Amino acid sequence: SRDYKRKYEFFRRKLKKQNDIPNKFEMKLRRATVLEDSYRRIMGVKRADFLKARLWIEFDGEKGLDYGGVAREWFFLISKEMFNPYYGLFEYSATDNYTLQINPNSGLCNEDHLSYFKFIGRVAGMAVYHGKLLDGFFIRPFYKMMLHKPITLHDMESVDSEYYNSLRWILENDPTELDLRFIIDEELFGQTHQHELKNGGSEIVVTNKNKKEYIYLVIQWRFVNRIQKQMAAFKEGFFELIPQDLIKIFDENELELLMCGLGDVDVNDWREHTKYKNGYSANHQVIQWFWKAVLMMDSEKRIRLLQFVTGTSRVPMNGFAELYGSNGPQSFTVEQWGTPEKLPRAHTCFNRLDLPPYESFEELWDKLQMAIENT
Numbered sequence: 001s002r003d004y005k006r007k008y009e010f011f012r013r014k015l016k017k018q019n020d021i022p023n024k025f026e027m028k029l030r031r032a033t034v035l036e037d038s039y040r041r042i043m044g045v046k047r048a049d050f051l052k053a054r055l056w057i058e059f060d061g062e063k064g065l066d067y068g069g070v071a072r073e074w075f076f077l078i079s080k081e082m083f084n085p086y087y088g089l090f091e092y093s094a095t096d097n098y099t100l101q102i103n104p105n106s107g108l109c110n111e112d113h114l115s116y117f118k119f120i121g122r123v124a125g126m127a128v129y130h131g132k133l134l135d136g137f138f139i140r141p142f143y144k145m146m147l148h149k150p151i152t153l154h155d156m157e158s159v160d161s162e163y164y165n166s167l168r169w170i171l172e173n174d175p176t177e178l179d180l181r182f183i184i185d186e187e188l189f190g191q192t193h194q195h196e197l198k199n200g201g202s203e204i205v206v207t208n209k210n211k212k213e214y215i216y217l218v219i220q221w222r223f224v225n226r227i228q229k230q231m232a233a234f235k236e237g238f239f240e241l242i243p244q245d246l247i248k249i250f251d252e253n254e255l256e257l258l259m260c261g262l263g264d265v266d267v268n269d270w271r272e273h274t275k276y277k278n279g280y281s282a283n284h285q286v287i288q289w290f291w292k293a294v295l296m297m298d299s300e301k302r303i304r305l306l307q308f309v310t311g312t313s314r315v316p317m318n319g320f321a322e323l324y325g326s327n328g329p330q331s332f333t334v335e336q337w338g339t340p341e342k343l344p345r346a347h348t349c350f351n352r353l354d355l356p357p358y359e360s361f362e363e364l365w366d367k368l369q370m371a372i373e374n375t
């Protein structure tokens, strides 16, 4: 079979170029109104295929800028807007998570929400098509729905561990005596909302004969049932740019990396293939604090730290042992530089972090985090 890199090459090979299209897609936008201007342009095109031409984007009448750079900025800005839970289309999957899911009540907020989701799908599609990234991390069932993969009990673990553990107990033990019914109780606005999982659900006892169905219905309720039209609209837009059959060569981890550049960073592998300069070593107090910091950063923050030091967010295949710098093989590097007063600096050409010898973990935490959020 093919690993991720070979799959991606294969994928691009099949993604043929449109010839029956204008040679560029022109889009003039104002920053104060990027979302509305982008929506009007991208949903107004005569043919979705027009969006496959070279992006020719202009902000606030600013002429004389590299159209390649402007596009990348646009994908960033439009992501921030589209995925902002304030608009009510997406929401965080849990109070303690940073991953996004489709808001079941998206329609209450926005009568025209299906066209907004189709638009979001078109833009996601445009990112994949033009080799750019969306800035946003979705829950794993989002990616699976895109790929028409079944949502499973396991998917519930990454999103809600308490719930996952309860359904798993149900799967492994006879639940009959608990006298559970085919209903779901959701806590909202200081009240309990009960929903029947099937007709007459309240009077149907969960047992070993029907618990596989119970679990299926609970999972569909949590991730699918209430957001079918929304996701259908997103997929419609997405598939106007990327043939659905082509996207199927990827699994859900590969797809997420493809679209959003996010994934789980093996800090162990990162750690073992780091080099040290000018006094630093694996056992050095400051270094011990560095790895302590990295270990307690979110996957998002780990990625962005990697981005800061290397210049890119991509984690090399076969791990950090094969990381490249600017002039050949160059391991991730931490060098002692500067006094504790200044922030850490990055030499991207050498994948090198210049790290002052801070005198406290919390100071290191503060200084390192400050440096990253500028990138």
Ligand SMILES: CNCCCN1c2ccccc2CCc2ccc(Cl)cc21
Binding pocket: 035, 036, 039, 082, 087, 089, 109, 110, 116, 117, 119, 120
């Ligand atoms: C009240 N409805 C809000 C609609 C959200 N929306 C916005 C946001 C700001 C300004 C205009 C609009 C309408 C167009 C639009 C288009 C796409 C998306 Cl994703 C959200 C929105």
